[PDB]
């Protein structure tokens, strides 16, 4: 029965190790991702949460009938 | 060819006001695109000095900019007087 239907304990042992490594890395990635989102939303210095401002190319830099702009 | 002629004859007989209105509106739409004086109107509009012409600082590299209004360089309104 063991020879025909099953494998040795090493396969399950090392598959468990691989699965555990993947799961732990995903957990730490999720925690880091939440922290990064919080910091970016608080400070606004990252690529995320970049809310639009007025484009400066719309300004007209020509004389304006009056010296004082 | 002959159908439109009969339709125009009927419209002129029954509703001359609408015929005249359509003819005048069509001329108003089409004639400006074929007139050589539209560009003259644009040039006349651009020749009206509403605001002050602010002078440019001389940098020693402005051969086409006048140093005085009566200097030959700059735009000329000779074409406007003879119009
Ligand atoms: C000497 C007398 C006493 C002997 C009694 C022996 C007791 C065993 C008999 C009971 C049958 C066991 C139940 C089957 C469950 C096994 C399912 C699974 O585990 O088997 C797969 C293997 O598949 C097997 O072929 C299972 C087939 C069993 C199908 C049962 C059907 C029997 C129904 C009878 C119908 C008869 C005719 C009907 C007429 C209408 C494993 O997949 P695999 O990943 O590859 O194997 C990994 C191990 N390796 C790497 C070493 C290969
Ligand atoms: C391309 C330029 C277009 C813009 C210019 C037009 C400016 C405004 C003119 C249009 C104003 C609104 C028009 C309203 C249309 C009226 C439709 C209608 O109902 O017509 C019938 C009448 O039928 C007609 O429309 C009359 C004949 C068809 C329309 C008129 C002629 C269409 C164009 C003809 C001239 C084309 C250019 C002139 C060519 C000259 C020869 C080279 C109305 O009569 P009823 O009140 O129902 O009768 C009850 C009482 N008896």
UniProtKB/TrEMBL annotation, chain A:
Cell compartments where the protein resides: Mitochondrion inner membrane
Coiled-coil stretches: 10-42
Subunit-level organization: Complex I is composed of 45 different subunits.
Role, per record: Accessory subunit of the mitochondrial membrane respiratory chain NADH dehydrogenase (Complex I), that is believed not to be involved in catalysis. Complex I functions in the transfer of electrons from NADH to the respiratory chain. The immediate electron acceptor for the enzyme is believed to be ubiquinone.
Family label: Belongs to the complex I NDUFB5 subunit family.
Protein name: NADH dehydrogenase [ubiquinone] 1 beta subcomplex subunit 5, mitochondrial
Gene: NDUFB5
First-to-last residue of the parent protein present: 121 to 189 of 189
TrEMBL record, chain B:
Annotated membrane topology: Single-pass membrane protein
Main location: mitochondrion
CDD domains found in the cross-reference section: NDUFA3 (cd22902)
CC annotations in GO: mitochondrial inner membrane; respiratory chain complex I
Region (Disordered): 55-83
Localization terms from the record: Mitochondrion inner membrane
Subunit-structure text: Complex I is composed of 45 different subunits.
Protein name per UniProt: NADH dehydrogenase [ubiquinone] 1 alpha subcomplex subunit 3
Lineage: Eukaryota, Metazoa, Chordata, Craniata, Vertebrata
């Amino acid at each position: 029965i063991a020879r025909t239907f099953y494998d040795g304990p090493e396969k399950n042992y090392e598959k468990t190790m691989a699965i555990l490594q993947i799961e732990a890395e995903k957990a730490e990635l999720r925690l880091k991702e939440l922290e990064v989102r919080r910091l970016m939303r608080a400070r606004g210095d990252g690529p995320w949460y970049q809310y639009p401002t007025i484009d400066k190319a719309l300004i007209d830099h020509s004389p304006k009938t009056t010296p004082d702009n | 060819a002959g159908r439109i002629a009969s339709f125009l004859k009927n419209a002129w007989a029954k509703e001359p006001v609408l015929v005249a209105s359509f003819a005048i509106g069509g001329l108003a739409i089409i004639l400006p695109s074929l007139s050589p004086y539209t560009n003259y109107a644009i040039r006349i509009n651009r020749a009206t000095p509403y605001n002050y012409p602010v002078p440019l600082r001389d940098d020693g590299n402005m051969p086409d900019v006048p140093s005085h209004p009566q200097d030959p360089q700059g735009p000329s309104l000779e074409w406007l007087k003879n119009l």
